[PDB]
Amino acid sequence: PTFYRQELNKTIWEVPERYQNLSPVGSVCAAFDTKTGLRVAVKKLSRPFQSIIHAKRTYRELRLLKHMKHENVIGLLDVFTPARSLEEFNDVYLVTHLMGADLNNIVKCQKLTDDHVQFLIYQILRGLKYIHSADIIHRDLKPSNLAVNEDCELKILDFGVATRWYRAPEIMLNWMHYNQTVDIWSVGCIMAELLTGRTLFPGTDHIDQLKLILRLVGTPGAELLKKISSESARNYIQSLTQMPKMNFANVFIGANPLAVDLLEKMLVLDSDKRITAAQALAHAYFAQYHDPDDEPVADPYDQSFESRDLLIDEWKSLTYDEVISFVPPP
Numbered sequence: 001p002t003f004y005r006q007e008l009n010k011t012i013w014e015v016p017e018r019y020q021n022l023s024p025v026g027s028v029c030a031a032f033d034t035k036t037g038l039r040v041a042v043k044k045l046s047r048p049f050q051s052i053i054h055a056k057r058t059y060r061e062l063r064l065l066k067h068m069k070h071e072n073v074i075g076l077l078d079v080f081t082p083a084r085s086l087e088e089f090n091d092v093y094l095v096t097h098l099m100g101a102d103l104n105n106i107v108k109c110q111k112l113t114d115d116h117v118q119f120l121i122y123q124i125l126r127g128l129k130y131i132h133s134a135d136i137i138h139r140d141l142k143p144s145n146l147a148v149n150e151d152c153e154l155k156i157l158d159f160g161v162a163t164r165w166y167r168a169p170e171i172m173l174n175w176m177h178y179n180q181t182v183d184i185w186s187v188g189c190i191m192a193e194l195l196t197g198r199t200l201f202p203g204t205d206h207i208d209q210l211k212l213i214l215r216l217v218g219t220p221g222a223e224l225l226k227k228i229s230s231e232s233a234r235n236y237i238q239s240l241t242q243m244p245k246m247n248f249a250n251v252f253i254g255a256n257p258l259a260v261d262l263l264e265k266m267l268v269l270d271s272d273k274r275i276t277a278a279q280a281l282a283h284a285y286f287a288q289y290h291d292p293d294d295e296p297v298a299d300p301y302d303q304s305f306e307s308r309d310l311l312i313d314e315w316k317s318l319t320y321d322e323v324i325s326f327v328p329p330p
């Protein structure tokens with residue numbers, strides 16, 4: 001393809017002629033895809049090979065986006081570099097279907113009915129079942145990572161306001177063996193906020209976050225305490241004033257009881273006891289949307305590179321191969 005060059009907010013964009021009307025939103029632009037007639041979101045990766053971590057991270061983001069082919073997950077329409085060889089290669093651009101806003105754009109100033117909450121959370125979980133089936137934990141699900149178009153159709157972005165608020169208490173405790181239900185926690189927090197119009201846990205730091213989480217869900221019971229390896233975490237938790245799990249009907253008063261029932265299955269304190277994305281999609285709150293024959297699972301995802309300790313030039317070369325081997329969704 002033929003490329004053109006421009007400057008948008010100090011950043012320099014070199015993209016094929018097919019992409020027109022670049023409009024600022026790595027750095028991100030909205031554009032018009034003349035080949036398909038659709039509006040797209042285009043991401044320029046900043047300093048992709050600045051260091052080993054940046055290089056592995058560049059490779060990681062690209063491998064992820066190439067694998068994700070699900071309606072409620074962000075995937076790739078296109079990948080390109082203006083580089084005409086591996087040695088020249090120092091820029092990665094990723095393009096996807098533009099939705100046009102995020103969930104935080106919607107919630108704000110806005111009251112959503114129970115049917116809208118059903119539709120939205122159904123989609124998040126449907127997307128998560130797919131992600132979790134590829135052995136991927138999102139880890140940072142929040143409103144700003146949920147892209148929503150005007151039909152209220154939703155795509156999860158950015159797997160690999162304040163992030164803190166939607167984060168699982170075991171991540172706040174700094175447990176290194178947290179599981180996928182860390183994402184179910186976030187969805188529970190996201191749902192709560194759509195039903196109520198306020199942040200369920202607006203904490204000022206990691207300590208306050210945990211404190212307000214335990215006020216709703218209670219202090220750990222015996223079963224959970226037995227699983228905490230760290231003496232200091234336990235000293236702390238058990239030195240707080242003990243707290244019962246609050247009645248979720250009292251707290252979320254006026255909400256569809258089916259939505260309150262799902263809420264408390266998602267926000268169970270012990271992560272071993274939290275509902276999975278697949279289980280949640282079968283919950284009666286989504287009877288209107290659910291179709292087991294249309295909640296697909298992902299092909300096997302090779303994350304074995306995660307363990308590997310490579311040179312910058314090695315991650316670069318690998319990323320280069322992945323740019324070149326790209327075949328669009330068509």
Ligand SMILES: O=c1ncn2nc(Sc3ccc(F)cc3F)ccc2c1-c1c(Cl)cccc1Cl
Nearest residue numbers: 025041042043094095096098099100101102147
């Ligand atoms: O609608 C969107 N669709 C996609 N993205 N992607 C990205 S990042 C990105 C990731 C993978 C790509 F292939 C390309 C990328 F740009 C950032 C925003 C975004 C939006 C969006 C917009 Cl355009 C405005 C306000 C809020 C959001 Cl969430």
Ligand SMILES: Fc1ccc(-c2c[nH]nc2-c2ccnc(F)c2)cc1
Nearest residue numbers: 016017018019020033034035036037
């Ligand atoms: F079928 C088509 C052909 C061209 C366009 C178009 C509209 N504005 N700019 C372009 C354009 C500019 C430079 N290179 C291109 F490939 C496209 C749209 C649809």
Ligand SMILES: Fc1ccc(-c2c[nH]nc2-c2ccnc(F)c2)cc1
Nearest residue numbers: 169170175227228229237269270271
């Ligand atoms: F105050 C607390 C105590 C425990 C948790 C917790 C929730 N799910 N899993 C854990 C957990 C399991 C094993 N080791 C840990 F450190 C944490 C969260 C907050």
